[PDB]
Design a protein around this ligand. Structure first.
Ligand SMILES: Nc1ncnc2c1ncn2[C@H]1C[C@H](O)[C@@H](COP(=O)(O)NP(=O)(O)OP(=O)(O)O)O1
Ligand SMILES: [Mg+2]
Ligand SMILES: [Mg+2]
Lengths: 51, 55, 51, 426
DNA sequence: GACTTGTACTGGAACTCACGTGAACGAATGTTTTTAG
DNA sequence: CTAAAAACATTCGTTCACGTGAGTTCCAGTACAAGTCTAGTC
């Protein structure tokens, strides 16, 4: 269990309460693939640069 | 480096025999001054495998 | 208990599983049985659930 | 190349192969001369996402394999290359692109005369003031700081010459600041002018009067030497002897008195027994021209002979008519107050008897300074794990003494360079 | 006072989760142009 | 002329890569307490 967000429900400009948002149903996704070095099968860092 | 019979090679080994498993085969082929690749590639000369597993 | 205490990550649960087919292991002896009861009580008071 | 006077080289470790190729192609399209491999022709080198130090490490490793006389290329950052490419010509280079003092005193020699007399004196005064309050740790650390200052090869004039020196914390550093920047330090002068310091120093100079007794007298209302003589009933024999001859013992002892005392003592030692040897230890053995007492060590070449020499020599000297006070009026140590001809003067003399096997150990224990001896003992017990005292060196693990036939063996077996007595001045 | 050892506290970074944005490939369908019968 | 084969255009779903806010917790860093400081004789 983990609240998606602790948000502020405002019935007015002064009447305010705190609520928590949860996802009782969430799409199940396959684990994210990772990149490995073919020669020796180790993780490889991914870096993006703009020039 | 007992002898030079492979020179440059990209040997791939997946499943060795019980008598000489992968740990005892990788260094054995490396002793001939070759290259070991855990997965096959375009340069790989051949892929060595014993028991026919899923891979 | 020593194995449980060795780890450092916070434990939400501490469970022990006893796979055996000996209803009365310490039948001939009695002091060993009492030591077992005392150790089980200590573990239960510590917060370890044995099944 | 259109720029014969400019040569550039790139670096693989951090720049990357793709960036290498892109930059090389762009520079070549812009006419710059880019070298595929490092060579003596290279004049400048570009390093990206790297610290200067590593760059130097990169250059030296490359320079070690180059012929002598080659001018090293200038180390620059990728910013220079980017600016040159943007402007189309080489942009001018600017600034952006472009064991020691061991803690233990047993390792650093301390000559008798140094170039930090004022600072050492101030630190010693602070140590004495701290000791007067019963805080032995403060006295020890201040003495260690003073010794560290004494061993400085060159005079200290700038604060920056205080970081690497050990045993130099906030208090000592602040005292050195006050001394160097202005002159007379506020704390040093304040403690010196304190009447408690003066009275305690005066009392301590009395033979047989220690810090505890001086403090007790302070709390009892005796603020000057006269009150001590007013009531000569609470003073023990040592204190009475010290006060009776206070003036004579206050004057420093000169080398002439040392030679006279040695000449007198040699005859007494011979009369007590022939073939005995006497060695002068203490401050005088270190080269000092002044002191408070003459320290002697008596030994015999044979092993079992050195049994009862000291009582015999003491009795012979007493028969001479020179002893004014004797520690005891079997023993192997005694400090007295000789009556040397002058009129006459009172000079403190210390005699010690040790066997030939333990002779080097006692000689080392008595020659070196108090602080030096303390530091050497601490180093022996902590680093090497051996117990060192005036009698011998002991190994707790192997219950066997590690005696030696020469004093230098003590330093040799402790993994320390040899020092002479003159350099053991704290 | 300076150093060393041991214990306790704590804010930042690593990890995970979830969402949004943008780019690329292939499937399926529809539509247009060109060429052999 | 004719239909049909090829080529072209569109929309959708899936995959992936990156960026970013929020919750949890693990640990390096900091702070603080306690011990040490030489060895012996008399
Ligand atoms: N607390 C101590 N711990 C270890 N050794 C000590 C010591 N006190 C003295 N010694 C050892 C080392 C000392 O070198 C030796 C001489 O003792 P002194 O005559 O009391 N002091 P010195 O001769 O250095 O100064 P001066 O010439 O003014 O007399 O005894
Ligand atoms: Mg002396
Ligand atoms: Mg003396």
């Amino acid at each position: 269990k983990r609240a998606l967000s602790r948000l502020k429900l405002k019935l007015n400009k002064d009447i305010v309460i705190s609520v928590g948002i949860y996802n009782l149903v969430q799409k199940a996704l396959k684990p994210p693939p990772i990149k490995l070095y073919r020669e020796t099968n180790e993780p490889v860092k991914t870096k993006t640069r703009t020039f | 480096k007992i002898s030079n019979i492979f020179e440059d090679v990209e040997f791939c080994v997946m499943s060795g025999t019980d008598s000489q498993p992968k740990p005892d085969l990788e260094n054995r082929i490396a002793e001939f001054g070759g290259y070991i690749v855990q997965n096959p590639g375009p340069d790989t000369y051949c892929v060595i495998a014993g028991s026919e597993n899923i891979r | 208990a020593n194995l449980f205490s060795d780890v450092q990550f916070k434990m939400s649960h501490k469970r022990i599983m006893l796979f055996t087919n000996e209803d009365n292991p310490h039948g001939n002896d009695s002091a060993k049985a009492s030591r077992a009861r005392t150790k089980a009580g200590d573990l239960r008071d510590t917060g370890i659930f044995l099944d | 190349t259109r720029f014969p006077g400019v040569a550039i080289y790139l670096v693989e470790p951090r720049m990357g192969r793709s960036r290498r190729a892109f930059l090389t192609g762009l520079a070549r399209s812009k006419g710059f001369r880019v070298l595929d491999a490092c060579s003596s022709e290279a004049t400048h080198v570009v390093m990206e996402e790297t610290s200067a130090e590593e760059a130097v490490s990169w250059q030296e490793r490359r320079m070690a394999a180059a012929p002598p006389g080659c001018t090293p290329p200038a180390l620059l950052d990728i910013s220079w290359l980017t600016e040159s490419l943007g402007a189309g010509q080489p942009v001018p280079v600017e600034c952006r692109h472009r064991a020691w003092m061991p803690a233990y005193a047993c390792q650093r020699p301390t000559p008798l005369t140094h170039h930090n007399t004022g600072l050492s004196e101030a630190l010693e005064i602070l140590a004495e003031a701290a000791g007067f309050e019963g805080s032995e740790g403060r006295l020890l650390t201040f003495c260690r700081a003073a010794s560290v200052l004494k061993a400085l090869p060159s005079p200290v004039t700038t604060l920056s010459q205080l970081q690497g020196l050990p045993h130099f914390g906030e208090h000592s550093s602040r005292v050195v600041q006050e001394l160097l920047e202005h002159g007379v330090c506020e704390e040093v002068e304040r403690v010196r002018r304190s009447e408690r310091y003066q009275t305690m120093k005066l009392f301590t100079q009395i033979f047989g009067v220690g810090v505890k007794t001086a403090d007790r007298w302070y709390r009892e209302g005796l603020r000057t030497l006269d009150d001590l003589r007013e009531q000569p009933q609470k003073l023990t024999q040592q204190q009475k002897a010290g006060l009776q001859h206070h003036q004579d013992l206050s004057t420093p002892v000169l080398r002439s008195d040392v030679d006279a005392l040695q000449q007198v003592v040699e005859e007494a030692v011979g009369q007590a027994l022939p073939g005995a040897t006497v060695t002068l230890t203490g401050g005088f053995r270190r080269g000092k021209l002044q002191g408070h007492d003459v320290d002697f060590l008596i030994t015999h070449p044979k092993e079992g002979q050195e049994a009862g020499l000291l009582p015999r020599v003491m009795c012979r000297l007493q028969d001479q008519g020179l002893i004014l006070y004797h520690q005891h009026q079997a023993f192997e140590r005694s400090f007295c107050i000789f009556r040397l001809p002058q009129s006459w003067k009172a000079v403190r003399v210390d005699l010690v008897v040790a066997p030939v096997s333990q002779f080097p150990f006692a000689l080392l224990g008595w020659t070196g300074s108090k602080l030096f001896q303390r530091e050497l003992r601490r180093f022996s017990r902590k680093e090497k794990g051996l117990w060192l005292n005036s009698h011998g060196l002991f190994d707790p693990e192997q219950k066997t003494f590690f005696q030696a036939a020469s004093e230098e063996d003590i330093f040799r077996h402790l993994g320390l360079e040899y020092l002479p007595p003159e350099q053991r001045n704290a």
